[PDB]
Amino acid sequence: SKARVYADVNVLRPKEYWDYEALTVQWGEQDDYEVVRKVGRGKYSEVFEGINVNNNEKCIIKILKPVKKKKIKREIKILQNLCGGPNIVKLLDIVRDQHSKTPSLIFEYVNNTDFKVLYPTLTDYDIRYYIYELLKALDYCHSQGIMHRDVKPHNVMIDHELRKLRLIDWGLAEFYHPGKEYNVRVASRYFKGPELLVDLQDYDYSLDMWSLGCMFAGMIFRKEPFFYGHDNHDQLVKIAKVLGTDGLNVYLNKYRIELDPQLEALVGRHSRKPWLKFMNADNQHLVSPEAIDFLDKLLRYDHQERLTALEAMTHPYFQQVRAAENS
Ligand SMILES: CN(C)c1nc2c(Br)c(Br)c(Br)c(Br)c2n1CC(=O)O
């Protein structure tokens, strides 16, 4: 399988663009940035609001836990390649502690409101607007030969007063090389695409489109997360209960894949459930026919059949967002 778009971007840019292991970091000055308060954390870092002591502007400081040189350079080189792109978080500086050699990445500040508190507030229009802004970022990174591999609401910072949106957490982003087999242990469980769950390794940018699909389903149906599985086998079961098993079987056969025997058994046999079956009184102001047609063209077992980020931006669901931009 190969990407249907931007397949050869890396193939014929100069090697330096994608050979992240040859990167040499230019270190800034640690004393330029002071920690103000803790704001978040992950398996790989603790994250602080900071201050730049020169201009007194806010920033974000990501203090990394011990990490292998290869891994960190992949993250840096990706951030540097994409810095300046629409709605990509800007990496402004990279510094380190002298004694411990502990690195910190310094980013622009976004005054985020936690999605679990923010999303219930959004209007139908705001949902279309923020999803369009996210699409701009995905088409951009895809066009530069990079898969993000971890799209989910936790990784999308939004200053709602400024109506600004940044895609963050590039810790799992990778360069796309046609026919390469990738590790399927990427993304976060509720947002993993069926190609990850059935061990199809030569995936591509379309993985991100599934994850965006899950986030969008969660927003319009007010069911977070939309596919609530407990481990990776159960995650494919939860998807098959909605998309139905006939379509799963077409996909596996098209790509010559045999599910593990016990996985076959947990999956069973299920009818496809129409998307209207999730509508209820609380969400009905969000589940209109353009929303469902758009969702249905992202949540497809077959990665090659999903909309590209560029085609998604043109879908009639976004027309008023485009009109306002054309002003
Ligand atoms: C816990 N993590 C990873 C994290 N939370 C973050 C938040 Br809230 C903001 Br605002 C920004 Br800017 C970054 Br960078 C964050 N990072 C780092 C990142 O997104 O790369």
Short mmCIF file of C-alpha atoms and ligand atoms in Angstrom, two decimals:
data_model
loop_
_atom_site.label_atom_id
_atom_site.label_comp_id
_atom_site.label_asym_id
_atom_site.label_seq_id
_atom_site.Cartn_x
_atom_site.Cartn_y
_atom_site.Cartn_z
CA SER A 1 0.00 0.00 0.00
CA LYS A 2 1.24 3.50 -0.59
CA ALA A 3 0.00 7.01 0.08
CA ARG A 4 -2.27 8.39 -2.72
CA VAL A 5 -0.85 11.88 -2.21
CA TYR A 6 2.58 13.38 -1.25
CA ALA A 7 4.03 9.85 -1.60
CA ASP A 8 7.43 11.03 -2.98
CA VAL A 9 8.12 14.20 -1.02
CA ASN A 10 11.04 12.72 0.95
CA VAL A 11 12.21 10.60 -2.01
CA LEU A 12 13.41 13.60 -3.82
CA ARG A 13 14.12 16.44 -1.53
CA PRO A 14 17.74 16.52 -0.42
CA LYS A 15 18.74 13.92 2.15
CA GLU A 16 19.40 16.50 4.87
CA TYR A 17 15.67 17.31 5.08
CA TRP A 18 14.73 13.78 6.39
CA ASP A 19 18.01 12.34 7.79
CA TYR A 20 17.29 13.52 11.33
CA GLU A 21 20.11 11.43 12.84
CA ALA A 22 22.60 13.87 11.14
CA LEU A 23 21.12 16.85 12.93
CA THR A 24 23.47 18.84 15.20
CA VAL A 25 21.51 20.82 17.86
CA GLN A 26 22.37 24.52 18.27
CA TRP A 27 21.83 25.01 22.01
CA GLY A 28 20.45 28.26 23.40
CA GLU A 29 20.80 29.72 26.85
CA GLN A 30 19.07 27.92 29.71
CA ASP A 31 19.06 31.08 31.90
CA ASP A 32 16.87 32.87 29.33
CA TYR A 33 13.76 30.89 30.46
CA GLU A 34 12.33 30.66 33.93
CA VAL A 35 9.63 28.20 35.07
CA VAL A 36 6.37 29.88 36.41
CA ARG A 37 4.01 26.88 37.09
CA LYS A 38 3.40 23.32 35.95
CA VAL A 39 0.77 22.93 33.23
CA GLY A 40 0.93 19.36 31.98
CA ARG A 41 2.89 16.18 31.77
CA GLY A 42 3.30 13.00 29.75
CA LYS A 43 5.17 9.74 29.85
CA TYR A 44 8.14 11.67 28.36
CA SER A 45 8.17 15.14 29.86
CA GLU A 46 6.83 17.66 32.47
CA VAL A 47 5.48 20.89 30.87
CA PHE A 48 5.52 24.38 32.37
CA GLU A 49 4.30 27.80 31.63
CA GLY A 50 7.49 29.93 31.55
CA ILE A 51 8.82 33.41 31.08
CA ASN A 52 11.47 34.60 28.62
CA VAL A 53 13.53 36.89 30.96
CA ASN A 54 14.65 39.11 28.05
CA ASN A 55 11.29 40.31 26.75
CA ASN A 56 9.08 39.12 29.62
CA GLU A 57 6.86 37.15 27.14
CA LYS A 58 5.22 33.84 28.14
CA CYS A 59 6.47 30.53 26.71
CA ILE A 60 6.04 26.82 27.30
CA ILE A 61 8.91 24.75 28.66
CA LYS A 62 8.95 21.03 28.00
CA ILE A 63 11.46 19.40 30.27
CA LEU A 64 12.33 16.04 28.88
CA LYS A 65 12.75 12.85 30.94
CA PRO A 66 15.86 10.85 29.86
CA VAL A 67 15.51 10.07 26.20
CA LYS A 68 17.66 8.38 23.50
CA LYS A 69 19.51 10.67 21.12
CA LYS A 70 17.77 9.17 18.00
CA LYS A 71 14.32 9.73 19.38
CA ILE A 72 14.85 13.31 20.42
CA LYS A 73 16.50 14.26 17.20
CA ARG A 74 13.55 12.92 15.18
CA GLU A 75 11.22 15.13 17.27
CA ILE A 76 13.42 18.22 16.91
CA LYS A 77 14.09 17.87 13.20
CA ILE A 78 10.29 17.44 12.51
CA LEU A 79 9.48 20.54 14.61
CA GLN A 80 12.19 22.55 12.78
CA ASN A 81 10.92 21.36 9.30
CA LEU A 82 7.39 22.36 10.12
CA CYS A 83 7.96 25.60 12.19
CA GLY A 84 6.01 28.42 10.43
CA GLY A 85 3.37 26.03 8.84
CA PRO A 86 -0.37 26.91 9.55
CA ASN A 87 -1.38 25.89 13.06
CA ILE A 88 1.75 23.89 13.87
CA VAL A 89 3.12 24.67 17.42
CA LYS A 90 6.34 26.73 16.99
CA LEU A 91 9.56 25.35 18.61
CA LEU A 92 11.41 28.58 19.50
CA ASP A 93 14.56 27.35 21.31
CA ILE A 94 16.23 24.23 22.64
CA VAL A 95 18.34 24.47 25.86
CA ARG A 96 19.88 22.15 28.45
CA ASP A 97 21.03 21.93 32.07
CA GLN A 98 24.92 22.02 32.21
CA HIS A 99 25.36 19.43 35.05
CA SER A 100 22.71 16.85 34.11
CA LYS A 101 22.52 17.52 30.32
CA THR A 102 18.65 17.46 30.77
CA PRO A 103 17.19 19.07 27.55
CA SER A 104 14.23 21.43 27.44
CA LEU A 105 12.27 22.47 24.34
CA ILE A 106 10.82 25.97 24.42
CA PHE A 107 7.60 26.63 22.48
CA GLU A 108 5.20 29.48 21.88
CA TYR A 109 2.59 29.82 24.67
CA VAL A 110 -1.05 28.94 24.02
CA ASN A 111 -3.53 29.70 26.78
CA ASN A 112 -5.37 26.37 26.31
CA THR A 113 -8.78 25.47 27.77
CA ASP A 114 -8.94 21.70 28.64
CA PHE A 115 -11.01 20.00 25.93
CA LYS A 116 -13.14 18.12 28.49
CA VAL A 117 -14.40 21.52 29.69
CA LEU A 118 -14.21 23.44 26.36
CA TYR A 119 -15.81 21.07 23.86
CA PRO A 120 -19.25 20.99 25.51
CA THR A 121 -19.35 24.79 25.09
CA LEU A 122 -18.77 24.91 21.34
CA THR A 123 -21.45 25.93 18.82
CA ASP A 124 -22.01 23.91 15.58
CA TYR A 125 -20.08 26.68 13.75
CA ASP A 126 -17.15 26.57 16.18
CA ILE A 127 -16.84 22.82 15.72
CA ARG A 128 -16.63 23.29 11.93
CA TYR A 129 -14.11 26.19 12.37
CA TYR A 130 -11.73 24.31 14.75
CA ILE A 131 -11.86 21.13 12.65
CA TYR A 132 -11.01 23.18 9.55
CA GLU A 133 -8.02 24.79 11.42
CA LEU A 134 -6.82 21.33 12.44
CA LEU A 135 -7.13 20.19 8.78
CA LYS A 136 -4.87 23.04 7.66
CA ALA A 137 -2.18 21.68 10.01
CA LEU A 138 -2.60 18.05 8.83
CA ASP A 139 -2.53 18.97 5.07
CA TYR A 140 0.62 21.04 5.79
CA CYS A 141 2.51 18.31 7.66
CA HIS A 142 1.42 15.71 5.13
CA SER A 143 2.57 17.98 2.25
CA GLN A 144 6.01 18.20 4.02
CA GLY A 145 6.24 14.33 4.20
CA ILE A 146 5.38 13.83 7.86
CA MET A 147 2.72 11.75 9.65
CA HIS A 148 1.81 13.06 13.04
CA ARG A 149 0.57 9.65 14.47
CA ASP A 150 -1.01 10.94 17.56
CA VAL A 151 -4.00 13.07 16.69
CA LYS A 152 -6.49 13.39 19.58
CA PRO A 153 -8.04 16.24 21.50
CA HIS A 154 -5.35 16.21 24.21
CA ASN A 155 -2.86 17.17 21.51
CA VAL A 156 -4.81 20.15 20.08
CA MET A 157 -4.35 23.40 22.07
CA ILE A 158 -6.99 26.03 21.56
CA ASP A 159 -7.05 29.66 22.88
CA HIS A 160 -10.76 30.11 22.43
CA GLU A 161 -10.75 33.91 22.96
CA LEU A 162 -8.18 34.36 20.19
CA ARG A 163 -9.78 31.38 18.25
CA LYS A 164 -6.23 30.06 17.77
CA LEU A 165 -5.38 26.38 17.42
CA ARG A 166 -2.06 24.53 17.55
CA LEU A 167 -1.33 20.90 16.93
CA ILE A 168 1.20 19.80 19.55
CA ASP A 169 2.97 16.67 20.81
CA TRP A 170 5.19 15.64 17.91
CA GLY A 171 6.78 12.82 20.01
CA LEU A 172 5.37 10.11 17.70
CA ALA A 173 5.58 12.00 14.30
CA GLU A 174 7.61 10.25 11.58
CA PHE A 175 8.77 10.76 8.03
CA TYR A 176 6.76 9.01 5.31
CA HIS A 177 8.80 6.77 2.86
CA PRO A 178 6.72 4.74 0.44
CA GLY A 179 6.61 0.99 1.17
CA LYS A 180 8.32 1.32 4.58
CA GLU A 181 6.91 -0.86 7.36
CA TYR A 182 6.22 1.10 10.50
CA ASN A 183 5.66 0.17 14.11
CA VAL A 184 1.95 -0.12 14.80
CA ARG A 185 2.38 0.88 18.44
CA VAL A 186 1.55 4.51 17.79
CA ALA A 187 -1.36 6.79 18.43
CA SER A 188 -3.46 6.64 21.57
CA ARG A 189 -5.86 3.62 21.92
CA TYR A 190 -9.28 5.24 21.31
CA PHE A 191 -7.87 6.98 18.16
CA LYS A 192 -5.92 3.99 16.63
CA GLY A 193 -6.96 3.16 13.06
CA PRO A 194 -8.00 -0.28 12.02
CA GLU A 195 -4.65 -0.71 10.11
CA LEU A 196 -2.87 -0.45 13.51
CA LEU A 197 -5.27 -2.92 15.05
CA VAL A 198 -4.83 -5.60 12.35
CA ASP A 199 -1.05 -5.12 12.04
CA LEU A 200 -0.97 -3.57 8.64
CA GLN A 201 2.47 -1.82 8.84
CA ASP A 202 2.87 -0.03 5.51
CA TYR A 203 0.41 2.66 6.46
CA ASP A 204 0.71 6.45 5.65
CA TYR A 205 -0.83 9.92 6.18
CA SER A 206 -4.33 8.47 6.11
CA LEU A 207 -3.83 7.09 9.66
CA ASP A 208 -4.18 10.73 10.84
CA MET A 209 -7.53 11.00 9.02
CA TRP A 210 -8.98 8.08 11.02
CA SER A 211 -7.86 9.71 14.33
CA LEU A 212 -9.38 13.04 13.19
CA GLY A 213 -12.57 11.02 12.34
CA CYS A 214 -12.67 9.66 15.95
CA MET A 215 -12.21 13.12 17.41
CA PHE A 216 -14.92 14.58 15.16
CA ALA A 217 -17.42 11.72 16.04
CA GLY A 218 -16.71 12.46 19.72
CA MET A 219 -17.46 16.22 19.23
CA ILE A 220 -20.65 15.96 17.14
CA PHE A 221 -22.24 12.99 19.11
CA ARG A 222 -20.93 14.22 22.54
CA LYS A 223 -19.54 10.79 23.35
CA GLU A 224 -15.91 10.99 24.48
CA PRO A 225 -14.23 8.80 23.44
CA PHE A 226 -16.42 7.60 20.62
CA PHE A 227 -14.81 4.11 20.38
CA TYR A 228 -14.21 3.20 24.07
CA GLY A 229 -12.13 -0.03 24.00
CA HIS A 230 -9.99 -1.24 26.96
CA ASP A 231 -7.03 -2.80 25.12
CA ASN A 232 -6.16 -3.11 21.53
CA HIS A 233 -8.26 -6.20 20.78
CA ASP A 234 -11.28 -4.74 22.47
CA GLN A 235 -10.67 -1.45 20.44
CA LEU A 236 -11.14 -3.27 17.14
CA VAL A 237 -14.25 -4.98 18.56
CA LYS A 238 -15.77 -1.61 19.44
CA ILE A 239 -15.11 -0.36 15.87
CA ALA A 240 -16.62 -3.56 14.30
CA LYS A 241 -19.79 -3.08 16.40
CA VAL A 242 -20.37 0.21 14.54
CA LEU A 243 -18.88 -0.23 11.07
CA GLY A 244 -20.03 -3.86 10.96
CA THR A 245 -18.04 -6.98 10.13
CA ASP A 246 -18.84 -7.34 6.41
CA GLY A 247 -16.78 -4.24 5.65
CA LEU A 248 -14.01 -5.53 7.93
CA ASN A 249 -13.86 -8.76 5.91
CA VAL A 250 -13.65 -6.86 2.55
CA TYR A 251 -10.71 -4.83 3.92
CA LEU A 252 -8.77 -7.81 5.32
CA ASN A 253 -9.23 -9.73 2.00
CA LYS A 254 -8.23 -6.72 -0.14
CA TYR A 255 -4.98 -6.47 1.88
CA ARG A 256 -4.41 -10.26 2.41
CA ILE A 257 -4.58 -10.05 6.21
CA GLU A 258 -5.50 -12.86 8.58
CA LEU A 259 -6.62 -11.83 12.02
CA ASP A 260 -5.31 -13.77 14.99
CA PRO A 261 -7.63 -16.65 15.91
CA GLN A 262 -8.66 -15.27 19.35
CA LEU A 263 -9.11 -11.77 17.86
CA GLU A 264 -11.41 -13.28 15.17
CA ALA A 265 -13.42 -14.76 18.00
CA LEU A 266 -13.71 -11.57 20.12
CA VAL A 267 -14.80 -9.67 16.98
CA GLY A 268 -17.72 -12.00 16.10
CA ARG A 269 -20.28 -10.90 13.55
CA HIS A 270 -22.08 -7.51 13.59
CA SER A 271 -24.41 -5.51 11.41
CA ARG A 272 -23.36 -2.04 10.39
CA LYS A 273 -25.11 0.54 12.67
CA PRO A 274 -26.32 3.72 10.80
CA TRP A 275 -24.65 6.90 12.12
CA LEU A 276 -28.18 8.26 13.06
CA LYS A 277 -28.38 5.62 15.71
CA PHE A 278 -26.08 7.76 17.94
CA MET A 279 -28.14 10.88 17.69
CA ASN A 280 -30.07 11.92 20.86
CA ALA A 281 -31.65 15.07 22.25
CA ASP A 282 -28.44 16.54 23.67
CA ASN A 283 -26.42 16.17 20.46
CA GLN A 284 -29.07 16.61 17.68
CA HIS A 285 -28.02 20.29 17.07
CA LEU A 286 -24.74 18.78 15.77
CA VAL A 287 -25.49 15.67 13.68
CA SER A 288 -26.78 17.16 10.42
CA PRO A 289 -26.48 15.43 7.05
CA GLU A 290 -23.31 17.29 5.95
CA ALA A 291 -21.63 16.29 9.29
CA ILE A 292 -22.56 12.67 8.86
CA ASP A 293 -21.51 12.56 5.18
CA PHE A 294 -18.15 14.08 6.17
CA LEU A 295 -17.70 11.67 9.16
CA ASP A 296 -18.66 8.67 7.02
CA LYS A 297 -15.86 9.61 4.50
CA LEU A 298 -13.21 9.66 7.31
CA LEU A 299 -14.24 6.54 9.38
CA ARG A 300 -13.56 3.90 6.68
CA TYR A 301 -11.77 0.60 7.43
CA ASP A 302 -9.84 1.04 4.17
CA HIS A 303 -7.14 3.72 4.62
CA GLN A 304 -6.96 4.30 0.85
CA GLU A 305 -10.64 5.20 0.68
CA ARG A 306 -10.56 7.95 3.40
CA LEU A 307 -10.58 11.61 2.42
CA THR A 308 -7.22 13.36 2.20
CA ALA A 309 -6.83 16.47 4.41
CA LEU A 310 -6.92 18.62 1.23
CA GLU A 311 -10.16 16.97 -0.11
CA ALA A 312 -11.67 17.30 3.44
CA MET A 313 -11.14 21.01 3.50
CA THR A 314 -13.30 21.29 0.28
CA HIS A 315 -16.26 19.20 1.69
CA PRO A 316 -19.58 21.13 1.75
CA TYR A 317 -19.61 20.72 5.57
CA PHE A 318 -17.04 23.61 5.71
CA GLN A 319 -18.46 25.94 3.17
CA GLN A 320 -19.32 28.77 5.59
CA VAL A 321 -15.84 28.56 7.21
CA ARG A 322 -14.36 28.94 3.72
CA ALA A 323 -16.70 31.87 2.93
CA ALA A 324 -15.60 33.77 6.04
CA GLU A 325 -11.98 33.24 5.04
CA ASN A 326 -12.67 34.44 1.52
CA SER A 327 -13.66 37.75 3.21
C1 LIG B 1 2.29 17.54 28.11
N1 LIG B 1 2.69 18.04 26.80
C2 LIG B 1 3.42 17.17 25.89
C3 LIG B 1 2.39 19.32 26.44
N2 LIG B 1 1.33 19.98 26.95
C4 LIG B 1 1.39 21.19 26.33
C5 LIG B 1 0.61 22.34 26.40
BR1 LIG B 1 -0.89 22.42 27.54
C6 LIG B 1 0.95 23.44 25.61
BR2 LIG B 1 -0.11 25.00 25.70
C7 LIG B 1 2.05 23.40 24.77
BR3 LIG B 1 2.48 24.91 23.71
C8 LIG B 1 2.83 22.26 24.69
BR4 LIG B 1 4.33 22.19 23.55
C9 LIG B 1 2.48 21.17 25.48
N3 LIG B 1 3.11 20.00 25.55
C10 LIG B 1 4.30 19.56 24.82
C11 LIG B 1 3.94 19.27 23.38
O1 LIG B 1 2.73 19.29 23.06
O2 LIG B 1 4.86 19.02 22.58
#
